[model samples]
Target: SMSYTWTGALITPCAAEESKLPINPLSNSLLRHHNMVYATTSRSASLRQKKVTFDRLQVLDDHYRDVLKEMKAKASTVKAKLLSIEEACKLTPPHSAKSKFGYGAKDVRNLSSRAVNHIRSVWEDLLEDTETPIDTTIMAKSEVFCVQPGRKPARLIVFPDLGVRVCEKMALYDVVSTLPQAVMGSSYGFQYSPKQRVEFLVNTWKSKKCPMGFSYDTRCFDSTVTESDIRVEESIYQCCDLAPEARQAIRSLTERLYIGGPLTNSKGQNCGYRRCRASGVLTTSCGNTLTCYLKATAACRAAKLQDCTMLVNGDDLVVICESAGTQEDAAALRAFTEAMTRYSAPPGDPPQPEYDLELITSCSSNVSVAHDASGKRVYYLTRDPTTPLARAAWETARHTPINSWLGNIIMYAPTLWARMILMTHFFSILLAQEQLEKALDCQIYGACYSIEPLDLPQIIERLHGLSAFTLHSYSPGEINRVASCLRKLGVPPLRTWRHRARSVRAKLLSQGGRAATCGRYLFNWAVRTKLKLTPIPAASQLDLSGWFVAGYSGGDIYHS
Candidate 1:
């Protein structure tokens, strides 16, 4: 079946969109080549559409059915409840699209009569209609990155009406929130923090007698998902002890909205029809994670990969397993790829046998070794800094809702690039503007959070530990990657960041209080005479619950 059937209607933008980062003094200060930083717009949607619209052929064998049965057994133990209208309303993002029925996200959140009344009716309609194709808005996601040759186009996001979105939460909020971890156990990637994730990878690597690992990348993963896959996902959800109403609503949603939907433009015109996974839905993160894990686990067995342990986050997968030998490992990986392809999830690039754990990248990050101030070795997760730096440059010059750089700093605090470049560059701007006290929004694990700039020291301490503040002696691989990215993106060299950090550190010290703590801890490496770093008092006091609980990308989650 084709993932999509288009009517030749354009995927239109709702408002004016910027393709390139705005040239501003502040942005230019951080990134010299403003032209290199570009954002995906609707103009590239046609190209993406061409790439994603394709036929899918799935051949699920005995191995797949066995894994499905096992997952179902685990799922049967879960008990999920339907969210109340108020609870569902509270989950709506404030800036979410307005309901076509004359209500908006704010109205829903505030429990406005118009919103509440419409939501009630929508729920009733869901109970009544089990086969009506729901309408979804198709938009090109605006993601910033440095220009590269043969660069891919913007990814498409297909989501339902605002009223239906809230209804989705009412029906499946508890299920998607709880069911994945219950089914997959520790194999569920969102269950681990960055540190815990690294520990799992490293420990799993060491546990194997002859370790062989590789990350599986599914090309246009969402598109590859077929109707059978979705129904199988629904069956897993059905195994749970769900409330009667929730179960009925789940089935109805699965049939009417989730299995396939009519794609509509922002102007409410019919754009096309989607038969694959809807990228923007309540079940997007959970469903993709579950489906990807199920496929990969079965594929591993089919390949006869011994004692395979997989860490799956959506379509991102990494498997650590006992190896037979070099040639055998390569052949087994090829078989694994073939199995995945038969299962309809083909790789964008072929999987390769990795003997070194750090060399295996998954979830766009890999574990790298660095040393702390006292010369203790530390393993931290890090990725290329080009995109984060580029997005930070865009956000700095413009007033954007999410501060990805802040999130990068929080999540990847111990990384050399984040500590040296992201922290130094952004903190310098914040201090200059005297807005260190201001709170900015950033996402970690896909949930939106409002974080104050001054609290970063404590937040970093909590997430990455005190070592994040004093980390030095980064591995050659990490340093070279960052350096290459810097040169590629035309960002200033490490020397410039070091000099800027010292000045920023001095300014932070002069301010006193949390600001001083930030200067002392985050920029200690910048100074020739490093300060004696210790744990901050406030780190333990911060309420950081639900930070790393689950993946909610495209799930429309907000955790203020």
Candidate 2:
């Protein structure tokens, strides 16, 4: 019953006749900004389309050969385990959008004969078809945003058929996630937890021995895929020591499906069809990550960018290397540009390189200043919460696929926005019996993760580090961004948030057991601090510290 029919409007609000529904819980102030950002980014992409949309001219050589070899050997170790049709069907969220193939997500969940049969057929097609190109259904993606932002125009992010989407899970999903980890090793960015990520940032920062790094952006990254490049990617997969069936399956998927998909536009007419990479594809995350790694590995040597250490998650690239001074920095960047360009990735816009820790912005996040428990200065990782907060506000009042609020709080809890606005709002709602339990909405990792309030502090500390519990003051950049975000999104500010938090805290306190503990642990920053912080409970029983360590080397290391 908590369903919100988000009528996907641009929030202009000045309509002739309106529904009795609240589309987003925003003040219309912040609603304006998301559109502005969309406008600006799309315009920018338009300007650079000329330079980047051409064919790739990757000149294969020893460095490229060596990187490909390394990737092959690493992938040889990964074993594919296909999922049962029933297991795969169950993984589909109940609220997932309807498929064109006559079965909705609910149908799949219920194991409707038609849905199961369609899913089985799709799985069979993926395994058997080695030649005919698969047609993917293009749809406007409805999802939350982040500060550093992700992907592109909401309209351009198309969708594959739901059955094929699940079939992707059965076939290539594990390969996408695990192969990058195995092949890229330390350079695999998404494999790290937030704690591990911050540790990498801090360690890399302290390693002034190679304190130079820059985040790379390739304009229209998905649109830049060439048929040759896609084939090369398949060849790289073929070299991996997969079983004959596994190799054929992977190759078939790559050739018949993964290479590209048809462009169906919003006008309801096929745009004289063109083939391009769909950002929504299952292999997208790892395909881009590994391909970019392979290119950068070659480019580093070709450009003679010495000892380049990489941390890449798809198109977000950060290269840490020895300080080449002002002149060489320029040259090294050019080499990177050239390598990526020839490999079919061109720089989005120029003016790259800002000195020092300012270069750490990878995955749309960077390390920033905050106060520790004792109000002492400490640095932790955070990003602009503008997008996440805007999206969270919408979720608070409606039913949406993604529960962006919890994910942000989990990922960016140390940020002022997460600690104050996110925590205050969610706790307040819980205290009021607005009911989040068994409310199976999408999360960062799952369809539903119990919405467990008791495990919050432990989860927070584990994800954000020990500093999160105590950190008070945050950076001014964070302040301005969040403030502008609030002003634009029309979100209520700190005092209003605090007013609600105080009310919520009291409610939680009066009702003992887990609610009081959740209130005390999560929202103590709003009022007086009540709970004394300790390390995660059962510390000796569950020490997951080593898994998240900074495993990669920086400048002057890890070269052949």
Candidate 3:
């Protein structure tokens, strides 16, 4: 099922640390900003804006037909079906925050009577009503974070009942998995590994003769989603050859609940508001991805932008298009902005063009430098220190199943941050518990997989390029920031991370299990000794490099 759900700790950095930071002066610097939450919007004095009412006339017109025709064309290539409640529940992660409803995720996984009845009733209600919308309750979400602190605010995360969420999986998860990719083709972004993402970006950049590129951002994207936007999405779904019950479920869900949900704050005091595409719906990632791609693709045509390539995740959009000279680039950008306004996404920041690869930022990532094994500068994507610090603190306590570390390592393995900072700290902690080879599940891009210490070498060569094995000499700024953040969060320092990596390396070699293989292949940089380099199947992975091996033509590799 393509419907995305987080199954780990709520892990809110906006909230204060559970315990205290270290007693060092450097730690104090980072801790001072810990209370400063990250917010995309400021809290209103009256809090009136927090509650908005949306009542609009709905129409299914030419625009709807166009999007639908396109969507249906793609659905022709897909075969989808409704998942049973038990099967759908199995996809749910054991650690997902329990529903506001009394039954927990554990209970639902066990097929408890209370959870089953609730899901069935929710299903019956959705099937029965194609007009009367459902009411979604709002809750607060503090999952994940950005680098800097916020204006210190709170948000209301409105979502369906737990049963309704499960029911949502049954109705549309399969559609979610296949339909959008079919509709958008190479534009579907979460389908890319980080290597694929960066490869396409670089390939697109070098493809053009001029090579100048720029990305567009919407001003407060989620807040700006109009009721009309959602209605338009419903039309896309309607165009697909869905089963009768599936279509009915979609219509009922869209009209009743998806169109708007009530917002409730942490205190349960925020006023009732009608939200279009609240963050917590099962449709959130797919819906936002499809919607943004559609809008941007159309806007590119309207702006006369040529050779435009897009890689979008949720609302963060990155575009690499051929340069039309600086003057026309500016004019073309303005036209693109105008077209986006026509589509309801106004500019958050003025769109600007970049001549060099490092200037382009997407998904909080930019091409940063490291010295690889050949002593050549290797560029990989990275972000600020805030979220990693917070996640590390939580993971130091060893999050439920020791969450997020493996995932981060896989995606950012070639970077100084993930390799030196994150891996060292986590592997050290796990070594004490003698769990070096213990496997855990992690999400990379949109897919999930079981990962362990032994998998790192193959993953890095595939993603960061094989030169990553020789990567060394991290920037000083990274070192100081790493030091500063650890103390601020009361986490251990560089010595401990080094200490842990050393012991973990030794344990892997001694254990002679899968851990030993990891010690042999993966930890050369952590320790001062390089194991003999040997051939890996990943060495032969040159066919397309993620379509998973692909030649990106404007990021397009729709193959024969």
Candidate 4:
């Protein structure tokens, strides 16, 4: 991850003899002319060539120009002395070795003071211009995105409510007869023409891919019957007329209907009629009779009625003689109501003490008490009442049950080994009181699992320090020994040993920097020397026979 820039290259002593050196003009006139031209010219035909030839020459010219400018600017003041070997040789009374050089002793002392002052000024400027350093020690506050502690699991309820109604034939007939006149007499003078008449709607009601029959009967009067004399005949209808009470009930029930499954809303509420968009609403091949099928199904399911046969019969009568073209259409409506009821059962009554007892015994926990509202309980260990203790208890109880359930459901569930690995880490943390208490209380433990790969060596070192056994640092022979052990322990055999052999070679080539490399070299050297092989090929190039050779070679190296 570190970034580097090219600072230039150095020619080593071995290559320095062949390197080209630049030449400068000897005469002062030529030098002055070249320097002036180089500084003054905006463009030059031979600029590239000039640059290659005068890399250091240009720097010397700039230095002299700066000195000349400084002298011109300070003409009013006394010029500073420029010391040389000749000036020092002419110094008076310079006999001692300490007085071999002649320069201002005061200037030498002032240099330190000047450096300190410049440093202080720069520090002040940096403080004023730079942004304040961040307080990296302080952790940023984060939002909790999972379930809240102590919250109960949501529960669903289903129940039914019913009412009775009765009406006479003449009354119903009179009401029916007035419908047409009432429509025609409206302010709009509404009338049904051949093209504008309402057509019959058909739907199918199916239960497990089978059709259900629907029938209804109503009293009718013959032409001979007058106000004085009347004869009633049963007029059987495939669809039934909607009663006043039934109509009102349907409207109320429809408004209250909700559907729920795994995909509930954020508030844990079931999908309701108001949220019924095209995507959410599921249509089935069930009956179309809103009264007969749907109403009966919803009512029965809501009531938790044991027998649904009576409800189905009631649905048949409701759908007969209705605007539906077939019994199937009526059935679809009934099916919708049934679906709604199944989908959105009301929250069930709180679990009884017996249910809590069952859960406790089943889980084999210290205590289990279902909350009043949501009927979910937390089982804990008496020894440790902390969240982690509860979590561990829950995991031990729930893991097998959940895994079994998952296994029954889909094939994509975690493999047994994977599940075991997951459970190992999960249970380890759960049972670790230090980690649990620290994490659950402060929330820092959640991030403990996010260890970096680069940090693994440190973690392993810590673990090794804790263990009673001393970790044998890695080496070539040790690697072979470990590989053989792993193979004996059921690890898959390598198809070829050449790769391992190459790895040993690389380790030997990179000796000093890493502990792993040192270990590997020691291991491989031991293996090769034990086998008495002058030049052992890498593991990657070795065939199956190499594994045997390596194993025997490792035994001798390690045993010694």
Candidate 5:
């Protein structure tokens, strides 16, 4: 076996203007009196300028402090629990001598199964209660765009619906308040600045659903999690700005409809459509998406006919209900059209003219009517609704239902907080690595390589350069092999290896990674050679050629 000598090559070229990097005067100041006065005055001003009400500010400050404490405490608890789990897993016969950096067959299979189940359960649970009433009127109008019956629906329907809800519920101030205080203060001086806030909220919301958030602050863009750029917030704002009163009325009507609607199926009830492999008697899936449309349409019709009663004699009323090409559309259209037809007009009032707006773009259909007795003219236009990619995404989401509220909470709150924490941690790590590398006067080879994936080349290169390096890998087999080899090579015992490995793994896997399998391809000679040896330890005594000859006759032996 040829022993590969690893060397660190500088991949990132140093900038020619590196010495021109700006230095902040605030960081180091020799004017002691001036510095002291400025600091005192700034601190005093900040204390005096209250952003919140006195009582509210105190409560908020206390709450924030308490949350920080709680987070720290919870983090500690989680860390301890993880450590316990690690130790317990380590003690298990199957994992007793496992490497902290490699993958093993037993670990890979078991861990992967557990991870897949966990993720599936998380997604399922998250989407469990995500039912929003579909606007049948919109669906009816949107249907003109529907090219095929029973085709997947566009996200536009859900987008506007959810957007309306979010716009109604989300306090613009609340969203603006969430922006980094420094960024907000710097970007917008003391004006109520709804535009900036709206922009921030829109970008944040968009980033939650898409990768477009990357152009914003590093704090906003999560390197670990690729997000959907759904401009849901913008959609919400647009809907509200376009028709505020109508949107509000729709919300009220939907609430009433929901109250009169069927009770939510109990938890653990087999509500989703079961696959062929599913086992359980109540395996039938509940068509909530369809139900949502029906309820929304009915509610809208009831509100328009009874609650609002804005219609007048000779009034030309055109109700356009657009829907995705799914069952939901059929349900919404039926309920809405039925409700419109069934509701009787008050005495002395002429029946309102109702026209169905189909969403078809190619057909260029338009309806124009003169003003009614009330002098309100109405026009109905319909066009073909969905793009191919949107249809595909809707199909996927339909099969795997996501909870609307949970998605909102995850996207807006927890996920953002996690990303912020991770970014802060990353900067901290970068600074620490920079300092460490500077002290040692050696290049850090694997700053970009996370411990969770355990890049062997980077690890070996770094180790060879630094005489030793710590690594983390989700795969027990890789971790074990790497740790064993390093140990055998007189490398220093990996300090806090298990602790760091678990933390890094949790973060990476939470984003998405196959645990128990090293992410990067296994092209390293040591890894390949070790894997080739049936009993990995047996290869230590045999020469490379001897090992190859022993296995040559077996069809598995091949020179790549």
Candidate 6:
């Protein structure tokens, strides 16, 4: 059967769409070119649909079953609790789409009687009904990216109603959060912060004798998911020691919504039906982590790759193993890809063996080396800056739903590109607006947070350490990637940014207090004479718990 069966109805947008970046002086100040930036819209959904629709072939072998049994044994140890209505309601994002039954996210968060009542009804329906195909609203996500060689169509997001979403959290929040760690262990990627992630990747690479690594990219991972895969995921959930209602709700959700559902457009027209993973559901992160790990672990065995260590974050997967020499390592990777393809998750680009750990990109980041202020070598993770810079310019020019640059800065703070291009440009803009104290919403590990600009110095120090401010002697390849990205986007070169940072640094320092701290810390690279950097007092006192507790991508999470 095909992944989707369409009714010939189009996926339509509810409001006006803007594809090109608007000509704004504020944005142009940070980025000279507007033509390079483009936003994805519903107009491209049909094209995305064509690319995603395909037949899947999955033949589970003894190795797959063996991995599943071991996973189930670990999952059986987990005792997961069902969340109460209020607890689940509190997790809903404030800007979440309103329920068709009259109440909105605010009402749900407030525990309003109408919202609570409908939520209770939805929960009751989940327990009673197991065959109804739940309705999902399909929309093309509006994400801004620099126009590159190949244009990627907007990703399709399929999710259900607010009331149902609350019920989902109530049934599976504890299960999803707890089960992945127990089952997958350190292979679970969401359990680590940016700094910690780099450490784990580096440590894993070093642990292997004569290590060879490669990253696997699954083409349309969400759409490639099959019905059996969802059921297998549900079976793993069933292995947990769950509440009776929770178990029933999990089973009901699997049949009713998770496996496949009817797709409805914004105009309430029936767009089609999906027989794959729902990208926007609460279990998306957990489910994908489990499924991808299952497939990759089995594939590793089939490839006969020895002493393999895997790090999986949703669809992003990387495997480091003892090399059987260059020729044999290359052959094993080909076998691994064939096994993965047989399991229905085909690679977009063929996997290549990488001897240098820095060249192995996973989760859109690669490990690169730089020196701290003390001249000791340090390793950090960074990606190409084209998208981050383009998105920052867009966010600075016009307000968007989420400020990704803030998240990028926090996660990739130690990167040369982030410290230079992202920090210099955005801080200059924030200083001009005099909104350093103002909080902006950004997501880390898929959870939304209202973080203030003034607190970034402390936050950066706490998450990334003080070396983030003092990192220098970046690798040639890393620097080249940024320089080429700048040229491609038509942004001013590093020399222009260095000149502007000196001016911004002066203005920030003259303002005193935290602004001075920002100038001293973030702009240290631009100055010919650098200030001696020390740990901020508040960084130690900051409560940063739950930042990397679990992955909540597409979970509709908003921290209030």
Model 2 CA lDDT for position 318: 87
Which residue pairs of candidate 2 clash?
Answer: 29-488, 30-488, 30-489, 30-490, 373-470
Mark the regions of model 4 whose C-alpha exceeds 4 Å error after superposition: 1-455, 466-505, 508-512, 515-560
lDDT (tens digit, per residue) of candidate 3 on 350-456: 88978887777886677666786667876667666567656554445435343566777877777655765676665655566777667776655433445665666
Model 3: worst 10 consecutive residues (lDDT sum): 551-560
Output the better candidate (2/5) by lDDT: 2
Span of ten consecutive residues with least summed lDDT in model 6: 145-154
* RMSD list, candidates in order: 1.1, 8.0, 7.3, 42.7, 30.6, 1.3
Off by over 4 Å in 5: 1-287, 305-422, 426-560
lDDT assessment of candidate 3 = 0.63
Each model's C-alpha lDDT?
0.90, 0.62, 0.63, 0.21, 0.21, 0.90
**Per-residue accuracy of model 5 over 267-302 as CA lDDT, tens digit each:** 212111101110000000011111112222243444
What is residue 200's positional error in candidate 2, in angstroms?
A: 1.1
Better of 1 and 5 by TM-score: 1
TM-score of each: 0.98, 0.82, 0.79, 0.14, 0.14, 0.98
Runs in model 1 lying further than 4 Å from the true structure:
none
Residue 56, candidate 6: Cα error in Å is 0.7
In model 3, how large is the Cα lDDT of residue 41? 28
Candidate 1 C-alpha lDDT tens digits along 259-349: 8889999887889999999999999999999999999999999999999999999989999999899999999999999999999999999
Worst 10 residues of 1 by lDDT: 143-152
Error (Å) of candidate 2 at residue 286 is 0.8
- Model 2, poorest ten-residue lDDT window? 551-560
Q: What TM-score would you give candidate 6 relative to the actual structure?
A: 0.98
